[model samples]
Target: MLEAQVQFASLWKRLVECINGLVNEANFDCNPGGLSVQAMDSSHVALVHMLLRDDCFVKYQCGRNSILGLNLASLSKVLKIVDSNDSLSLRHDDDSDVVTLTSENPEKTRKCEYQLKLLEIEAESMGIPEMDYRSTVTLNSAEFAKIVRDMQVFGDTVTIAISKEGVKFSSSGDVGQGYTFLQAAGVEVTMEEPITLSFALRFMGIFAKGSTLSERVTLKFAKDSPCMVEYGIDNVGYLRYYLAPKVD
Candidate 1:
């Protein structure tokens, strides 16, 4: 019998949406401390690291650290039925071949259950190492999204240059060029050195989809190095994405 039950206040749906496109399936490491997942896209061009702290849950009971192989697509469909503010509880046992998802409305008057078959996927364990970045900028998510979206209209790639002055995004194509800047007063900027990098607009747009997870996003990178984008989940933890730079 399954002896563990973890209840999430309101993060179920958003969590599923955030990792859905990044990977089709992955192993969720559940411990007394909480849940965590590490996954990379098929092309290995991007990676996402997630953590849902134990304190973030209303109820968390686990005998030991257990890894659950999850089919994200199936979980995504199940989460689609969940609404914001709804109560979500996940129950499973080490010996069980099927996992159960229980959803309850705020009033606890309505409830539903979905049974999904478990997989035996052996996921690779990857550690996110600390990097020495030359530039780091934190700004309003909406503003960053607007800037990146606008750059898309000019070219397929975007050049990011960061210095003490601020951060600038520019793109050029047959149609000419487009440029946007966020000054120091407009956002937070930190730099130990100056660096510039280029990345595909398509991938940047994909990473920007995560802007909804927070009001602000922190971007850190160095010349010819992978960039890191991070978002905090209020009282919970953080979600991070690392994307490789595009070189010609």
Candidate 2:
């Protein structure tokens, strides 16, 4: 009957806040069992991917194979009106023209449903590439959010580098450059490997904007390749953010 207590807003808020600066369309893959999505920006260096399950919610349901094409701006506006604490329900209209998210309040007995016309999204098998990463670290989400806020001062492109010891973020311009670092929990860490790479400054903004919703972010990197950043919200849901390296 329902997929989860969380509304479509739950997913929308994060994606809109993260990728809106770089991309517009988000392609999602859904099945009766679970769901996953993957996409790369025009440059092919940056990528975004995520997986979700039906039962991750208090309730879950799906009948057939489906691919959903979503406009992030439209979805973000809808989620904005939803109460964070209210329960969210999703249902497909019979005409298959639209999908809706309904947020209901039990005590006040109020409800609101947001709708969007469905677009033709082709379901292609997308893979989340695997990497034997040179470095990995789990950092607090709020802490990163703060750093990202300051990064925007330099403009849209930002650089992220990591080592076995710790992590570093920076931005550059005609005025010069700026950087910040977060350390590992116990021992001081440094990249056993070196990583000096750049990404859209705006991308970090979107990720930071939504950072308040979660507590931790898991970052993974390989030598001068695509980087993986994940935000864990609840037991059943996650945000997989992909960013590719930049070249002069």
Candidate 3:
């Protein structure tokens, strides 16, 4: 048997939205420590790593470690019904194909339940390399989200350049050219060196959705590796996204 409950359901919604488009199915490694997931997109263009510690939950109980495979689409639809105020609870029986979701109001007066079918997904977890990124810039989440959204409107790819000065996002296509610059005169920045990278707009959009989850978004980039977009999940853990750079 396995069970857990969280006071705010919106956190789960945030997780689903971050992952829904990247992978069709995912395996959540559950234990007394809570739940964790790591997966790469089919095209291997992006990877997501998430952690929800036991303390994040109001109640958590798991006698042993278990791997729960979930169908991302189905789970997303089910979670959509949960209001941010809803107290969400989940349960599963041994060797069961279904996972039960129960949401109740604060008063515990109204309750809704749904049983979501689990997919038998055998997902291979990929390891994320530990690299000393050249440039680490922490910016306001809203600002980062806005820049990504704006740059995406004009092109299919985004060019990111960071230095001791600040960070810049620029894009250009046959239509026109656009750019957003953030000088270190305001935002926080740590630079081992300067780095510039190009990544697809499609993946950056997914990372932008994380703005709703955290007020701060940190970007780590280097000429040697993909850009890492990270957000701190309040009481839970962290959500980190890695996207491969587009080749010239």
Candidate 4:
């Protein structure tokens, strides 16, 4: 066995604040209930796709269910930004994406890396319904950020057109006409009717700048409907984020 330490943040403010950001994006789906995740890394591929069911959580309040999908990389940034003196600890490092967590001890410094086998964390993830997402894809997070920046000059609203040819992001403004497209279809998925939709650049800024818990973002959307962007996961509900599409 190894050793580690813990801290509750100054008055527990920063620690609590850090976790708050994870609510929007959780590794586990949650409501009034709880959830759990379990999976293995792929060989043909890499990394694993562990998941959480509602019951695994700690409590059983009113509204509750067993289904969660979120962004993980963004969550990582949030945790990394915290003050070191707050709290951190780690025990094992099994070649996994080792993460050491240490709590306040004041005896010695606290922080280490460890490979993870099983982990369980609980949190209140906001409630919502899945949309009839017509346009879908395994889009690159960095590329999406580019789309946001490209459309910034257009207007508050940008139209997202999805087809077999890939995904197209377009907008019209006093400046002129703007267009952004990513052809990942034949290699990704076949498209249907151009599920072109519009979203606010204002919100896109919030999304593009914020730190995602993972790379390669997933965007599910529909024409004139809300969109679902799924990132990676670092913890349970402790770090899963989902953002609805923006309105013009």
Candidate 5:
């Protein structure tokens, strides 16, 4: 059995919105530590990972670990009825195939409840290895979102080159070519050597959806490796996405 409650419904709503765009169905693993999810997009070109620690919840109980497979689209629809100030509660029994969600206002005058059926998803857990990246950059999430959005107008892919001086984003297509540079002084950056990489703008756009969940975003890159994009959710936990660079 598992039971958990979050004081703010808006936080959960924003999290769902961030993940639903990249993943459809996912298994939410619940344990004493907290809740975590890992899933890849339909094309298997990108991976999404999310973690919400028990400290983020007002009430949490897990007699035993449980995997709750849910369709994000359905879960998102049910959360649509919730007010930002509402408190959300989740309940699930060991033998049950559905999860119960309750939403209530502070005054206790308004309340709503819904049951969402769970899926029996067969997901093979992946063991992501840690690495010492060559470059790490932290910048405003809104700025990153705008950069990706604007670069899409110029091409299908964006090339990122980071040096001690600054970071540059450039794209070229039949339409034209464009580039944006951010001086090192404008952002926090650390690197042993300069690195340049290219990735699909579409995936970056999807990952940028996390911009709504946090004010800052961290990016880690290594030679011939997938780039890691992370957004820390205040005191809660974090949302991370990994996308492989364009080979060509």
Candidate 6:
């Protein structure tokens, strides 16, 4: 059995959209540590990891650890009915095949309940190895999203070069070539050496959806390794995306 409640339904509403943008189905592990999910995109080129701590919920209870397999698209559809003033409650019993979502208004006069059938998904949890990235850049989440969105128009791939001076984004395609630069004046960047890598802009655009959850976004890069894009979700937890660099 598992039960969790968040004071604001909108928080969950936005989270569902953020996760659904990259993954279609995932297993949410509910334990004493709270709720977490690690899923890779269908193409297996990108991975998303999300965690919501117990403190993020107003009321939380988990008799035992449970894995809830769910279709994120369906969850997003159900969450669309939530109101800004509503609180969300998630409940499930050990014997139940479906999870119940209840949304209630502050006045308690209105309540909406929806049931989502759970799926039996076979997924292996991957242990992400720890690595001391060569470069770490912290900037506004909105700014990152805009850069990805704008770069997408120029090409299918974006080349990022980071140095002590600043960070540069460049793309070339049939339309033309485009370049965007961010100075260190407002962005926090740390690197042992300069690094330049190219990645698929399509995946970056999808990952940028996380900007809605946080004000700041962190980008960590290493030579010949996937880049880690992370957004800290307030006091709750984090939403991280890993995408490998493109190879010529």
**Model 6, runs deviating above 4 Å:** none
Tens digit of lDDT per residue, candidate 5, span 1-248?
A: 79899998998898898899898889999999999988988887888989999998999998788999999999999888789899999899878999999999999998899999999998845545477788999999999999999999999899999999888999999889999999887598899999999999999999998999999999999998889999999977999999989986
Clashing pairs in 1: none
* Per-residue lDDT of 59 in model 1: 74
The digit string of per-residue lDDT tens for model 6 on 1-248 reads 79999999878887888889888888999998899988888887888889999999999998789999999999998888789669999999977999999999899998899999999989755555477799989999999999999998999999999999889999999999999999996699999999999999999998898888898999999998889999998978899999989976
Write the residue-wise lDDT of candidate 1 on 65-119 in tens digits: 8788889999998888776666777889668888888777768898888888989
Where is model 5 poorest over a 10-residue stretch in terms of lDDT? 123-132
Candidate 5 lDDT for residue 53: 93
Q: Scored by Cα lDDT, where does model 2 land?
A: 0.66
Candidate 6 yields a Cα-based lDDT of 0.90
Task: TM-score each candidate.
Answer: 0.91, 0.81, 0.95, 0.50, 0.97, 0.97
Q: Candidate 3, which segments miss by more than 4 Å at Cα?
A: none
Clashes of each: 0, 12, 0, 43, 0, 0
Candidates ranked by TM-score, best first? 6, 5, 3, 1, 2, 4
Q: Which candidate wins on lDDT?
A: 5
Residue-level lDDT tens digits of model 2 in 1-248 = 22434544455455455655455666656677666666666555556665666765555666776667777677767777776667777666344767777787756488887788766755434456777777676777777777777777775777777665567888877767788877665323434566766776656555555465567777777766667678875677677777666777
lDDT of each: 0.81, 0.66, 0.88, 0.47, 0.91, 0.90
**Order of models, best lDDT first:** 5, 6, 3, 1, 2, 4
Candidate 6 contains a number of clashing pairs equal to 0
Where model 1 places Cα greater than 4 Å from the true spot, the runs are 1-10
